[PDB]
Amino acid sequence: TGELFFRSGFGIGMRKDSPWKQNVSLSILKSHENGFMEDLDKTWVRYQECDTLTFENMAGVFMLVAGGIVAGIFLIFIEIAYKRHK
Amino acid sequence: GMMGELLSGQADMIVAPLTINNERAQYIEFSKPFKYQGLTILVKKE
Amino acid sequence: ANLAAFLVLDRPEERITGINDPRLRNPSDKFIYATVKQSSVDIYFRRQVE
Amino acid sequence: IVTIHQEPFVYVKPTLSDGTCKEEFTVNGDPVKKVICTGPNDTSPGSPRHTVPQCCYGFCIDLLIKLARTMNFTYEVHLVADGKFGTQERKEWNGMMGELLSGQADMIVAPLTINNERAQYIEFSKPFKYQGLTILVKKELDSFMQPFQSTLWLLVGLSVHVVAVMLYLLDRLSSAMWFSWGVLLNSGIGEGAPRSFSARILGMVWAGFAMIIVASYTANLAAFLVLDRPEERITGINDPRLRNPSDKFIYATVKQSSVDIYFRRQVELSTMYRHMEKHNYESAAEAIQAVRDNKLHAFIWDSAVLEFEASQKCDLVTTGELFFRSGFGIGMRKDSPWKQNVSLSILKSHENGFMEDLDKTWVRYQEC
Amino acid sequence: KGFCIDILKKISKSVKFTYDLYLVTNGKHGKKINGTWNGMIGEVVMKRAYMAVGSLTINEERSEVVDFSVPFIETGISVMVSRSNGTVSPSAFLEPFSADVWVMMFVMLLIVSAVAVFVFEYFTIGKAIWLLWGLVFNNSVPVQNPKGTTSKIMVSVWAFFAVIFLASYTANLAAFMIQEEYVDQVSGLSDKKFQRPNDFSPPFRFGTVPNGSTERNIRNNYAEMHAYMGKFNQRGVDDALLSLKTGKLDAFIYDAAVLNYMAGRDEGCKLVTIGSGKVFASTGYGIAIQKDSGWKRQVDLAILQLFGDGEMEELEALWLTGICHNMSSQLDIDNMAGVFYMLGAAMALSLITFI
Amino acid sequence: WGLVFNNSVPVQNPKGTTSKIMVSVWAFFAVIFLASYTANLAAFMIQEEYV
Numbered sequence: 001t002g003e004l005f006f007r008s009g010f011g012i013g014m015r016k017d018s019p020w021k022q023n024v025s026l027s028i029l030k031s032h033e034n035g036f037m038e039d040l041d042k043t044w045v046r047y048q049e050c051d052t053l054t055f056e057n058m059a060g061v062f063m064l065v066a067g068g069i070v071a072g073i074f075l076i077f078i079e080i081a082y083k084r085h086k
Numbered sequence: 087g088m089m090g091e092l093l094s095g096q097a098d099m100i101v102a103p104l105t106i107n108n109e110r111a112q113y114i115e116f117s118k119p120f121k122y123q124g125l126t127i128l129v130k131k132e
Numbered sequence: 133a134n135l136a137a138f139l140v141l142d143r144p145e146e147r148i149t150g151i152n153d154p155r156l157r158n159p160s161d162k163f164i165y166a167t168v169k170q171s172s173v174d175i176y177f178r179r180q181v182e
Numbered sequence: 183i184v185t186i187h188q189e190p191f192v193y194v195k196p197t198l199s200d201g202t203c204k205e206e207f208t209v210n211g212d213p214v215k216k217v218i219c220t221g222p223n224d225t226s227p228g229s230p231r232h233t234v235p236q237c238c239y240g241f242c243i244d245l246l247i248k249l250a251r252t253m254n255f256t257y258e259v260h261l262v263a264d265g266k267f268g269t270q271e272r273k274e275w276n277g278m279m280g281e282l283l284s285g286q287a288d289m290i291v292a293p294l295t296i297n298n299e300r301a302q303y304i305e306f307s308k309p310f311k312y313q314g315l316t317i318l319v320k321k322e323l324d325s326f327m328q329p330f331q332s333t334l335w336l337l338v339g340l341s342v343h344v345v346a347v348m349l350y351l352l353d354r355l356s357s358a359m360w361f362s363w364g365v366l367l368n369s370g371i372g373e374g375a376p377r378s379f380s381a382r383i384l385g386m387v388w389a390g391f392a393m394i395i396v397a398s399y400t401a402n403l404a405a406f407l408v409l410d411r412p413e414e415r416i417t418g419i420n421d422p423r424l425r426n427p428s429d430k431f432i433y434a435t436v437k438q439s440s441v442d443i444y445f446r447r448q449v450e451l452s453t454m455y456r457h458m459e460k461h462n463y464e465s466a467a468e469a470i471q472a473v474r475d476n477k478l479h480a481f482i483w484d485s486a487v488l489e490f491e492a493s494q495k496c497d498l499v500t501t502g503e504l505f506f507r508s509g510f511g512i513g514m515r516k517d518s519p520w521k522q523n524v525s526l527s528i529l530k531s532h533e534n535g536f537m538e539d540l541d542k543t544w545v546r547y548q549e550c
Numbered sequence: 551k552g553f554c555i556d557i558l559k560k561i562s563k564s565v566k567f568t569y570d571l572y573l574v575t576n577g578k579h580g581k582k583i584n585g586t587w588n589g590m591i592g593e594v595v596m597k598r599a600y601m602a603v604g605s606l607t608i609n610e611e612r613s614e615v616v617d618f619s620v621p622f623i624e625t626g627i628s629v630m631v632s633r634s635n636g637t638v639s640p641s642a643f644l645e646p647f648s649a650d651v652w653v654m655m656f657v658m659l660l661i662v663s664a665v666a667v668f669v670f671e672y673f674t675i676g677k678a679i680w681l682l683w684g685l686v687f688n689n690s691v692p693v694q695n696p697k698g699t700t701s702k703i704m705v706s707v708w709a710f711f712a713v714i715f716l717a718s719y720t721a722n723l724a725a726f727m728i729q730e731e732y733v734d735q736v737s738g739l740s741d742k743k744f745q746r747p748n749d750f751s752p753p754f755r756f757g758t759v760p761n762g763s764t765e766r767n768i769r770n771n772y773a774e775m776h777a778y779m780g781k782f783n784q785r786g787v788d789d790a791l792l793s794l795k796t797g798k799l800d801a802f803i804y805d806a807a808v809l810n811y812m813a814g815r816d817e818g819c820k821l822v823t824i825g826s827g828k829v830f831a832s833t834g835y836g837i838a839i840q841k842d843s844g845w846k847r848q849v850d851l852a853i854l855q856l857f858g859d860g861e862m863e864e865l866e867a868l869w870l871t872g873i874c875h876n877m878s879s880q881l882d883i884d885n886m887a888g889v890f891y892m893l894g895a896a897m898a899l900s901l902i903t904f905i
Numbered sequence: 906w907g908l909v910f911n912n913s914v915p916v917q918n919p920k921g922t923t924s925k926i927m928v929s930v931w932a933f934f935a936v937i938f939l940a941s942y943t944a945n946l947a948a949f950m951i952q953e954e955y956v
């Protein structure tokens with residue numbers, strides 16, 4: 001979270017007064033020209049990606065009714081026995 | 087540190103993820119950036 | 133209605149609003165800072181007296 | 183004593199032919215009659231007007247009466263034809279500040295903001311009512327079916343008719359349509375499905391559709407209802423629209439007041455004032471009347487009266503951060519011997535909650 | 551006055567020199583017109599002005615003729631089209647959450663129907679299934695299959711559990727309905743629709759503005775895209791924004807910073823940008839200098855020093871921060887098409903089973 | 906009142922297919938009103954007025 005307080009760009013540092021600065025600058029500009037860096041980012045970041053109701057609000061009532069079924073059948077058997085012995 | 091590797095002479099390029107500040111540009115040029123990012127704070131999810 | 137209200141109770145994730153957050157800017161005993169040693173972060177923090 | 187005609191703090195009411203008018207009693211009772219004030223008939227609307235005495239109670243009359251009782255000094259309340267508060271010339275002052283400088287009034291008991299120049303020239307003693315500046319904007323209930331429209335209603339009607347006719351087409355009659363209509367929305371019939379070969383499956387399929395559609399309708403209408411309009415359109419000076427002036431937006435402020443001094447104090451805010459210096463108004467009542475008809479986008483720098491105006495109108499919303507924190511004070515002349523006495527009196531009155539009682543009795547009376 | 555004027559003032563404060571700003575004589579930006587540049591690039595290559603400040607996108611062609619400077623703001627190529635109004639995904643019939651809850655409810659219904667049949671034995675199975683469905687969906691009053699009262703406790707508690715489950719489902723649907731993802735039909739320049747509008751959909755316009763670095767980059771990258779955009783060559787910036795707002799212009803493919811500023815203005819509520827930080831050809835508005843006298847190092851160091859401090863951040867916050875940035879819920883037929891598709895699939899399955 | 910609220914034991918007072926339209930439309934209006942009331946209660950449950 002939070003805003004970006006330092007928009008910094010990763011660069012290609014070389015030796016001081018290096019004669020290859022122009023070539024590497026042209027190459028790094030051509031990389032943005034054809035979207036090679038964007039293609040690499042889409043290949044890497046997207047591949048390594050990842051992401052309320054559950055059994056907590058669903059299995060509880062099922063467990064309760066499963067437990068109460070035994071009590072209900074026991075009460076039914078008791079009522080049948082009482083009627084038979086009545 | 088790493089900035090000394092580009093001045094002692096053991097290497098010629100420092101190509102790696104490294105933020106650019108106002109101190110490393112005093113003598114050695116970093117040409118143009120290839121990936122822009124903003125510094126953000128990250129915390130554990132609740 | 134109460135169940136719907138409870139379900140839309142999103143967990144607050146934006147605890148810190150960047151570097152401008154007074155809770156993070158002001159040092160505290162509970163809060164602990166962390167940064168990469170010998171990097172540009174130390175230069176940036178020490179560049180200004182703020 | 184020089185007083186400004188600010189309706190929230192000093193109401194305007196012409197007297198009757200007898201020279202005085204009886205103030206209406208309040209809920210508490212025992213109203214305090216305002217003293218006779220020689221105010222302009224129409225605040226000089228571009229033409230000279232007679233100084234007809236008028237009755238003006240407002241809010242500051244009670245404070246002035248308390249100060250007079252504590253200090254035991256006579257008072258003569260009078261308004262100014264110009265109506266200006268005070269600012270730099272064009273080497274003098276104009277309005278209430280100019281009247282104080284000219285020696286016409288030795289003290290001013292009126293709602294007046296304090297800035298650097300005013301504090302340098304005269305002393306405000308201790309403020310009694312603190313108010314941070316804020317902006318006000320004139321603020322600018324669903325269908326009977328919510329997500330569905332006329333086309334959607336026709337589509338769902340065609341679909342339900344099609345499934346109803348297909349039910350008795352596959353079953354084979356006329357009773358199937360009536361049963362479907364009855365079971366579409368609760369209710370029910372004693373016939374039921376035949377459940378011979380595939381009627382039970384069709385009945386089970388067409389049993390959860392109603393619950394799903396009513397749940398979707400309720401969710402859509404609830405989402406529409408919680409779609410509250412944004413009230414904080416401008417977040418004070420931090421808003422880019424407020425910070426950067428635009429042709430479409432118009433900035434209005436009271437002319438010859440501390441607003442110009444505050445704007446000129448900061449150089450970076452010069453473009454906020456210089457680019458919008460021709461839209462100022464000499465009177466707050468005219469600006470309020472203009473913004474009532476949506477002619478003005480927003481008004482700023484009169485929060486102590488803007489809040490009361492918004493409460494009375496119940497239509498204009500007030501937002502924006504309180505960037506300028508200050509309070510209304512009582513002005514005295516340079517090296518005035520009464521400054522200490524009035525400061526002690528106002529501090530004593532504030533200590534016992536008299537100011538809070540006056541606020542809760544007058545400003546809190548109109549709550550909206 | 552402007553952001554660039556503030557940057558130049560800060561540079562003058564940091565480094566003492568003399569400057570005289572000159573408006574562009576011909577054109578707007580650089581363009582290789584018969585081998586001759588124009589605008590700021592044409593002026594700097596003609597030694598008229600050593601320093602060029604403006605919306606000069608850094609590219610290989612521009613850097614070849616005139617040296618550039620360190621960028622201070624990230625920009626690129628972006629698309630800002632919001633004429634289409636897309637509602638939420640049609641997941642009302644089967645939301646991603648509670649995927650296994652439906653199967654659990656079905657197996658519980660089967661179990662309770664079997665238990666009811668067993669206790670009745672000690673058409674019955676069909677009657678029990680119908681009673682369970684009627685108690686769950688509450689669409690119609692079910693026929694009471696059991697005759698006694700002892701077994702009624704099980705069916706009553708199962709009906710109560712079904713009512714609780716239905717209430718939870720309604721609450722979950724209401725909670726999901728408040729989402730404001732607003733997944734529009736936008737994919738970027740990589741999509742085949744934008745690259746070849748004629749092949750994909752004739753009612754589509756690229757709307758790329760010519761006479762600019764972005765137009766040249768698009769033409770170099772794809773000739774077909776440039777040919778398609780040549781038939782919708784907009785003029786100016788305000789006119790293009792007005793055309794997009796009125797619906798005449800399909801989309802805007804100008805600079806990312808300009809698109810962000812337009813979306814942050816008054817006429818940007820219905821013309822928001824893509825919303826993705828990454829943009830095509832991520833570059834900046836570097837100052838173009840001939841570097842004949844080697845003065846590029848000083849200005850680069852000054853820009854780095856300004857960026858290191860908080861002046862750049864506060865200046866960007868003051869200037870490059872629009873309004874109405876990022877529930878606006880809307881109703882559409884595609885949102886409710888999911889339940890229609892589910893009903894059609896169920897009807898087809900029932901017809902197949904009957905046949 | 907049976908159709909407005911949770912279903913209960915019904916009475917077969919109507920006799921014929923020509924009298925079911927009135928009860929059907931009454932039930933539809935009642936369920937629509939109940940759904941609107943539930944949605945309004947859900948919307949008001951998240952109000953910030955309570956403190």
Ligand SMILES: CN[C@]1(c2ccccc2Cl)CCCCC1=O
Nearest residue numbers: 393396397400716720939940943
């Ligand atoms: C009639 N069925 C509903 C209901 C409404 C109110 C109370 C209970 C229930 Cl169960 C209709 C409104 C959506 C949720 C639902 O199931």
Ligand SMILES: *[C@@H]1O[C@H](CO)[C@@H](O)[C@H](O)[C@H]1NC(C)=O
Nearest residue numbers: 576577578581588760761783
């Ligand atoms: C660019 O502008 C020049 C003049 O400023 C004009 O002659 C030329 O036709 C323009 N090119 C395009 C493609 O609009």
Ligand SMILES: *[C@@H]1O[C@H](CO)[C@@H](O)[C@H](O)[C@H]1NC(C)=O
Nearest residue numbers: 632633634635820879880881
């Ligand atoms: C969808 O958005 C467009 C423009 O953003 C607007 O004109 C239209 O009314 C919106 N539709 C709905 C149903 O909100």
